[PDB]
């Protein structure tokens, strides 16, 4: 697959996020328990709640599509569908809203992805969500200063940074320590205080943010200068326009 | 035939049925099984005799939580269902042994009614079905128990509800797949105002059958609306064939190849490869490490892309066994395929746009609901001209129980009655058989 | 020198607008705001009076971790907190809607033919003036024929009246001028000539029913109320039997054959009668706005006054209350009429067009769309990138999408003189913006945006329509914020650049050229400011009939 | 053989055509000419090519007084009408041998269009007629002149108006006898939403043909609504026969006997005498110098009384050559006959009630209008189940020019196109002939 046109670093980064053969750079290690804590859907050690019986216990209709499409493990078990939601600063966060949804539907099975300006969400069966969430938090999808895990009160993608280079958070879920240079998650994604905070690593430096970002800006790489990417968007506009008129 | 195209027809198990059938053998205008399905849905009514009985015995008539103290009537309707149904059939039929059907179900608790075709041949629309059925049953119940002039108005309220004070049959104990003509978003929309859950109920959650029924209804409405006339007719017919009827086994084969481990993205890659292999698209221009594809047949590209869209829904929502992400598949299949190819997505962006609003109105406070409550007449999902709703039906058929407003919740009476009709339950079978029968008349 | 939005950004923040960092969390939350403090205090008072908790700052999340900003009303020097621009809190905005809702236009042409042909009686400027005296007594709710009638209190219904207009100057001059909308006074000479030629010898009434009635009732009341009192006044003034067969002809004329509603009725899912916001086509909204007759040497000002009119009505009142409600959609709309932001972007585009093509001189084709809409989109997006205060101001992607595309689409229409290529430019802007920032609006913002390019030039049943004829009930447009008022502006744009007197209906244009309206349609943004300052005096209040 | 009744059928000159016709041979469910008329009304559209051309040249599109400066397009549509109409027909038709009709009128200024029946056989309702016709003509105009993509939307607005922003085709330059399905007062009402002026236009002011067309439409609607099912079927059939089809020459003979000098009251006296002579009524009781009449056949009494009502209208409004008094005749015929006999009036008081409201709403400030703007779907005149509106059509046929909102004013396009269709113009002839042809199949 070729994914996306363009000859900038932004364009190549957009292609790399979508390409399942591109190995996402892992930047930090997070424990399984700490992912569960950040998610906030169940306590560590708590059994997964169910919304319906295991598929093996139900009489499914005779259906070639069911036979050919392997359910994800959390579907087999009857897990709830739960979410993880991220906000990405327009000041050079590595991932950005449509990049995430495009990449999620290339990389992950059984995924409900939603894109908005200030928030981007994936919903899937709980156990599978945990595994995806680990990758979303450990890799270059996430910077702890320029990205935030937020299930509500998402404001900040478009705001000025604070003095430490941290994005605004109305609920201050991610705290930078000036003495240590590291960020800790002190609340889960919906804003309830954690027992014990989760280390999220150091923020990426400016040069690394610029290498990794998928937003076009005048002070990085401008979209208007990525003429091959612009050309394709204009092509799509023209072809859609002509098609609606006559085919 | 107006068009040169031929398609190979397959069944819901991916087996070849008939080779090289003219495309127009699948047209709503020509295919006798599509005609039977449409005329059948116009004329079929589900009657809830148990519901009528309970309404009367409690005086709970005329809408949610309504009751008229002192008006109770203790009538053994279900115990006398055979007599009442026979009496109603005498009034519903035009002549003896015509195509009127009245069939009891559930030990007399329900009845399937099919009002004779002759009534619709001299009608403007389809409301004769509920109205003729309702009055026949009202009259049959009054006559069975010799209900007095003073009390008979309660029987009317128990059957048809608060009509005509309400515009709708509010609180009625009869149901149809269609809804009243006043609720159309535009002229020509009646076959669109059929809930997704009703289609999934009638087809017993068989994914391919649900997708077929939905596509037949949607694309048939596109003829009634005038959308499939002139310049656009072939696009509509190719979409019916490839997205809804598994033409050339393309949907089925894309699911087969991507079902074990695939994603929306892997289905896109396979569809683009197949479109190239078949000569539907070709490289037009090379940019830097990027090929720009072109086509000399946009309607056929659209049909191939639409098959892929159905397959991507079946792979993504099938893997979850959860319907909600259909809104996301309908959006990102289209968004991703445009940037993959440089060609327009399904319905020239209108599926993508439908999916943006559908996503919003299935994940927000403002309206909408779960996938199953949508339909082609819904303001959220009317915009694509038949290429979005059939995927929603496939997704709902695949849901293993994640929805509150499921077909079990919204569509039980429809399920019990409408699933009895073979052409409603297994439309892919009958439409394919009819297309093969008429293939040399086209 | 400065971009037009710089003064507003300097008022909002301590930092220069270019600065990238700021301080949060130490502003006192809601306590930083005079208005939120007023609300906290009022909530305590309300809850105590009624015995039910109400407004409480401690419920949910704590507002005011960032600066709670003032907004400049564009083209004014008035700065207000955004709560003063909520329609509930702004009497000017409520009166603007009431003045539209309570208006209908009703011909006298059929009526005069009934009098002459069926009754055999004469119609002259003298009989018309007599009829107009009579209907100005009857229209507010007072009697002319029967004994023992009870009547509305004149002071409660002081805003209701009937005027007439006609293209025939000599006839207009013979009717008492108290009753006439004088086209030659209200419009500049070339516009007056166009409007008079459209009306010809037709004579049309502009009827305004009482605001108190419109508020008690609905918009579908307006043409009924109008017709009843027209009917009574025709009986009185022309000596009919008071109720003969001919009386029915006047009824059918006034209610059906020669009525112009402001809005048409809506389908069942959004059921509403006539004269509700969703029925008002974009071309009518542009014509209701009176900027065209006062600001005609500045097409940007005309177009953006139309956008202000429509963003408030369509997003705040219509989508934000009739179709939803609650806190609603104030700032989705204020983005289009505050801080001089849309103004900066649209002046840029107008200048680009003027210098490259000349207004109205570009080819009406896709090449022009691709050129102008792309250039203007890139300019607007660059401003959010160069001015971090601008980006924090218009913090929601939807707001930014609407503002940038409105400039792009209006500018394209300034170039081509055609609203349909302006609309194509709006959709192209969206696509470019989405790819540039990897985001656009809210979850459902681009439903119409993705259907948009294909539906601009479609001719299919529920797809094809000139933009002027579209409105909030065009299927793709029926649900979402950040489009409708901007489309009214794009409808206005080519007509403003051309110098046309109207966009879609000359009768509607003349009907709002009336100094006896309560709201001043020549200066919509000024009026919004007046209402924000609690300085606007609406009609329809009940003070006279309630205790002191 | 559901019913034993037979009637003698006459023409519009009072000559016997067929004796001893079983009543059910006139039923809408059985009579092939009623079927043809209803299917024809569903499928027929008038196209104003001159109007489309003038709307385009002036940019006056989208409703009253509307205009878009700068959008004018000067196209020689009327001058190229044959080519445009032929191109449209190719899109409208399903096959070359079907029942599509496209006929130019007025030197190309107008077209008669009958959309093929096969489209309606797979449609829910009737809106395919205007919508298929409109898009075929839009596309044919665009193709004739190679109208650009940039301008083609004006052609669409000139043909179909402000739709879909308006619910109706506001400003359209096409017309049908039927109106959009959203405007139905109730399900089943579509054949009632046909303006009286349109019926009088189509029948060229022939009084008995206007009465017949109106009765056929109204009584056929009564079947669609379920009103003519079970207990009330015979009453509706007898009313169709005696009121609208001049059965037994009763209407005609009452008119002949009362036309020179008669009044409503003299018609009543003759009808009561005739009902007594025929054994439909008999004296039940004697009061003080006053005979109370009874009957063993209320449906037949109602049919006799309805024939009298029609004849009273023709005598009273015919003598004035002025239609307004039909509201008065419909009221006082019924009021007077109840006090003359002691029996209920036509439709058991529902004609009288309709007439009270119709009189008010044709002589007051509040709504309504002249007789010609009413119809069976109008809120004022919906109440009688087929027994009032045919009299209004007779009265407007007899009007010599007293009305402002005449058929010339409201229905000129309908007049030019729909009067060309023989079965719309002279329906009595065709229904009588079809009844005779099927008499032995009953
Ligand atoms: C709960 C939802 C989902 C839903 O259906 N509607 C919400 C909430 C709703 C509520 C919020 C009121 C409150 O806080 O109680 C109201 C005011 C509608 C109402 N019920 O009156 C609203 N949104 Ni929302 N909503 C808005 C917006 C937005 C932007 C905010 C992005 C940001 O970075 O701050 C995002 C969508 C996006 O990302 O593009 C958004 C989301 C959301 N919007 C998320 C909550 C986001 C969060 O958790 O913080 N709105 C805007 O982008 C600007 C205008 C603004 C609206 C109020 C106004 O117009 O003044 C408001 C309009
Ligand atoms: C979708 C539909 O809601 P339902 O699905 O019918 O509940 C519709 N609401 C809306 O379109 C809401 C529009 C205003 C709020 C969202 C603005 S983006 C309505 O209430 O008629
Ligand atoms: C008949 C109808 O008017 P039209 O014939 O449609 O103009 C209808 N009015 C009314 O029913 C008026 C009722 C109130 C005044 C009379 C009270 S007796 C209405 O406006 O919709
Ligand atoms: O978050 S959502 O886009 O659903 C609503 C925005 S107000
Ligand atoms: Cl094609
Ligand atoms: Cl009988
Ligand atoms: Mg690990
Ligand atoms: Mg730890
Ligand atoms: Mg593959
Ligand atoms: Mg069976
Ligand atoms: Mg400073
Ligand atoms: Mg600083
Ligand atoms: Mg005169
Ligand atoms: Mg004055
Ligand atoms: Mg004076
Ligand atoms: Mg010529
Ligand atoms: Mg032929
Ligand atoms: Mg061309
Ligand atoms: Mg006599
Ligand atoms: Na049968
Ligand atoms: Na053959
Ligand atoms: Na400052
Ligand atoms: Na700078
Ligand atoms: Na709070
Ligand atoms: Na609704
Ligand atoms: Na007071």
GROMACS .gro file of N, CA and C in nm, chain C residues 119-180:
model
  186
  808UNK      N    1  -6.714   4.242  -0.668
  808UNK     CA    2  -6.802   4.336  -0.601
  808UNK      C    3  -6.847   4.451  -0.690
  809UNK      N    4  -6.773   4.480  -0.798
  809UNK     CA    5  -6.804   4.596  -0.882
  809UNK      C    6  -6.777   4.732  -0.822
  810UNK      N    7  -6.679   4.741  -0.733
  810UNK     CA    8  -6.648   4.865  -0.661
  810UNK      C    9  -6.512   4.921  -0.701
  811UNK      N   10  -6.480   5.046  -0.672
  811UNK     CA   11  -6.358   5.109  -0.715
  811UNK      C   12  -6.248   5.094  -0.611
  812UNK      N   13  -6.125   5.079  -0.655
  812UNK     CA   14  -6.006   5.088  -0.571
  812UNK      C   15  -5.924   5.209  -0.619
  813UNK      N   16  -5.889   5.297  -0.529
  813UNK     CA   17  -5.810   5.417  -0.563
  813UNK      C   18  -5.706   5.441  -0.456
  814UNK      N   19  -5.611   5.533  -0.467
  814UNK     CA   20  -5.520   5.561  -0.357
  814UNK      C   21  -5.594   5.608  -0.233
  815UNK      N   22  -5.709   5.673  -0.246
  815UNK     CA   23  -5.789   5.715  -0.133
  815UNK      C   24  -5.851   5.594  -0.060
  816UNK      N   25  -5.906   5.500  -0.137
  816UNK     CA   26  -5.963   5.382  -0.069
  816UNK      C   27  -5.853   5.300  -0.004
  817UNK      N   28  -5.735   5.289  -0.062
  817UNK     CA   29  -5.620   5.219  -0.007
  817UNK      C   30  -5.578   5.286   0.123
  818UNK      N   31  -5.572   5.421   0.125
  818UNK     CA   32  -5.530   5.487   0.249
  818UNK      C   33  -5.633   5.462   0.358
  819UNK      N   34  -5.761   5.468   0.329
  819UNK     CA   35  -5.867   5.437   0.423
  819UNK      C   36  -5.858   5.294   0.480
  820UNK      N   37  -5.834   5.200   0.391
  820UNK     CA   38  -5.807   5.062   0.428
  820UNK      C   39  -5.687   5.052   0.518
  821UNK      N   40  -5.580   5.129   0.491
  821UNK     CA   41  -5.462   5.124   0.574
  821UNK      C   42  -5.478   5.186   0.710
  822UNK      N   43  -5.559   5.291   0.721
  822UNK     CA   44  -5.594   5.342   0.854
  822UNK      C   45  -5.669   5.233   0.933
  823UNK      N   46  -5.764   5.171   0.864
  823UNK     CA   47  -5.847   5.068   0.928
  823UNK      C   48  -5.763   4.951   0.972
  824UNK      N   49  -5.675   4.900   0.889
  824UNK     CA   50  -5.597   4.781   0.925
  824UNK      C   51  -5.494   4.814   1.031
  825UNK      N   52  -5.447   4.940   1.039
  825UNK     CA   53  -5.356   4.972   1.149
  825UNK      C   54  -5.424   4.985   1.284
  826UNK      N   55  -5.554   5.008   1.288
  826UNK     CA   56  -5.632   4.988   1.411
  826UNK      C   57  -5.656   4.839   1.437
  827UNK      N   58  -5.693   4.765   1.333
  827UNK     CA   59  -5.736   4.626   1.356
  827UNK      C   60  -5.619   4.535   1.378
  828UNK      N   61  -5.506   4.544   1.311
  828UNK     CA   62  -5.400   4.447   1.313
  828UNK      C   63  -5.346   4.417   1.451
  829UNK      N   64  -5.328   4.514   1.539
  829UNK     CA   65  -5.278   4.480   1.672
  829UNK      C   66  -5.377   4.402   1.757
  830UNK      N   67  -5.505   4.400   1.717
  830UNK     CA   68  -5.609   4.322   1.784
  830UNK      C   69  -5.725   4.408   1.835
  831UNK      N   70  -5.779   4.494   1.747
  831UNK     CA   71  -5.891   4.579   1.783
  831UNK      C   72  -6.002   4.571   1.681
  832UNK      N   73  -6.124   4.607   1.721
  832UNK     CA   74  -6.245   4.573   1.648
  832UNK      C   75  -6.293   4.686   1.557
  833UNK      N   76  -6.360   4.646   1.449
  833UNK     CA   77  -6.416   4.740   1.350
  833UNK      C   78  -6.561   4.720   1.314
  834UNK      N   79  -6.623   4.602   1.340
  834UNK     CA   80  -6.762   4.579   1.299
  834UNK      C   81  -6.857   4.548   1.415
  835UNK      N   82  -6.822   4.446   1.496
  835UNK     CA   83  -6.921   4.390   1.591
  835UNK      C   84  -6.934   4.476   1.716
  836UNK      N   85  -7.052   4.472   1.778
  836UNK     CA   86  -7.073   4.530   1.911
  836UNK      C   87  -7.020   4.436   2.017
  837UNK      N   88  -6.978   4.493   2.131
  837UNK     CA   89  -6.937   4.421   2.251
  837UNK      C   90  -6.813   4.332   2.227
  838UNK      N   91  -6.717   4.387   2.151
  838UNK     CA   92  -6.588   4.322   2.132
  838UNK      C   93  -6.490   4.367   2.242
  839UNK      N   94  -6.409   4.273   2.283
  839UNK     CA   95  -6.300   4.299   2.378
  839UNK      C   96  -6.172   4.300   2.298
  840UNK      N   97  -6.070   4.375   2.335
  840UNK     CA   98  -5.959   4.410   2.248
  840UNK      C   99  -5.826   4.395   2.321
  841UNK      N  100  -5.719   4.385   2.242
  841UNK     CA  101  -5.585   4.386   2.302
  841UNK      C  102  -5.550   4.526   2.353
  842UNK      N  103  -5.468   4.526   2.460
  842UNK     CA  104  -5.423   4.656   2.513
  842UNK      C  105  -5.324   4.720   2.415
  843UNK      N  106  -5.356   4.838   2.359
  843UNK     CA  107  -5.270   4.898   2.257
  843UNK      C  108  -5.123   4.904   2.292
  844UNK      N  109  -5.093   4.929   2.422
  844UNK     CA  110  -4.951   4.945   2.457
  844UNK      C  111  -4.877   4.812   2.457
  845UNK      N  112  -4.947   4.699   2.479
  845UNK     CA  113  -4.882   4.567   2.473
  845UNK      C  114  -4.850   4.526   2.331
  846UNK      N  115  -4.914   4.585   2.232
  846UNK     CA  116  -4.909   4.545   2.092
  846UNK      C  117  -4.863   4.663   2.005
  847UNK      N  118  -4.783   4.752   2.064
  847UNK     CA  119  -4.742   4.878   1.999
  847UNK      C  120  -4.653   4.855   1.878
  848UNK      N  121  -4.590   4.739   1.868
  848UNK     CA  122  -4.497   4.701   1.763
  848UNK      C  123  -4.564   4.642   1.641
  849UNK      N  124  -4.697   4.620   1.646
  849UNK     CA  125  -4.766   4.561   1.531
  849UNK      C  126  -4.825   4.672   1.442
  850UNK      N  127  -4.814   4.653   1.310
  850UNK     CA  128  -4.860   4.753   1.214
  850UNK      C  129  -4.857   4.693   1.075
  851UNK      N  130  -4.906   4.771   0.978
  851UNK     CA  131  -4.905   4.734   0.835
  851UNK      C  132  -4.852   4.854   0.754
  852UNK      N  133  -4.754   4.830   0.667
  852UNK     CA  134  -4.711   4.929   0.569
  852UNK      C  135  -4.729   4.868   0.430
  853UNK      N  136  -4.718   4.951   0.328
  853UNK     CA  137  -4.724   4.906   0.191
  853UNK      C  138  -4.603   4.958   0.115
  854UNK      N  139  -4.577   4.892   0.002
  854UNK     CA  140  -4.480   4.946  -0.095
  854UNK      C  141  -4.526   4.912  -0.238
  855UNK      N  142  -4.474   4.990  -0.334
  855UNK     CA  143  -4.506   4.967  -0.473
  855UNK      C  144  -4.392   5.027  -0.555
  856UNK      N  145  -4.373   4.973  -0.675
  856UNK     CA  146  -4.277   5.031  -0.770
  856UNK      C  147  -4.326   5.156  -0.841
  857UNK      N  148  -4.454   5.184  -0.833
  857UNK     CA  149  -4.511   5.303  -0.896
  857UNK      C  150  -4.501   5.424  -0.803
  858UNK      N  151  -4.410   5.515  -0.836
  858UNK     CA  152  -4.381   5.629  -0.749
  858UNK      C  153  -4.500   5.721  -0.728
  859UNK      N  154  -4.578   5.739  -0.837
  859UNK     CA  155  -4.690   5.831  -0.836
  859UNK      C  156  -4.800   5.780  -0.744
  860UNK      N  157  -4.822   5.648  -0.746
  860UNK     CA  158  -4.918   5.588  -0.655
  860UNK      C  159  -4.871   5.589  -0.510
  861UNK      N  160  -4.744   5.553  -0.490
  861UNK     CA  161  -4.681   5.560  -0.358
  861UNK      C  162  -4.694   5.697  -0.295
  862UNK      N  163  -4.673   5.803  -0.377
  862UNK     CA  164  -4.685   5.942  -0.334
  862UNK      C  165  -4.826   5.981  -0.292
  863UNK      N  166  -4.928   5.909  -0.340
  863UNK     CA  167  -5.066   5.945  -0.309
  863UNK      C  168  -5.116   5.880  -0.180
  864UNK      N  169  -5.048   5.778  -0.130
  864UNK     CA  170  -5.086   5.710  -0.005
  864UNK      C  171  -5.022   5.782   0.111
  865UNK      N  172  -5.089   5.800   0.223
  865UNK     CA  173  -5.029   5.867   0.338
  865UNK      C  174  -4.892   5.808   0.366
  866UNK      N  175  -4.786   5.888   0.379
  866UNK     CA  176  -4.650   5.838   0.391
  866UNK      C  177  -4.626   5.766   0.522
  867UNK      N  178  -4.714   5.784   0.622
  867UNK     CA  179  -4.698   5.703   0.744
  867UNK      C  180  -4.703   5.552   0.718
  868UNK      N  181  -4.774   5.513   0.613
  868UNK     CA  182  -4.801   5.373   0.580
  868UNK      C  183  -4.709   5.320   0.471
  869UNK      N  184  -4.615   5.400   0.420
  869UNK     CA  185  -4.541   5.357   0.301
  869UNK      C  186  -4.393   5.334   0.331
   0.00000   0.00000   0.00000
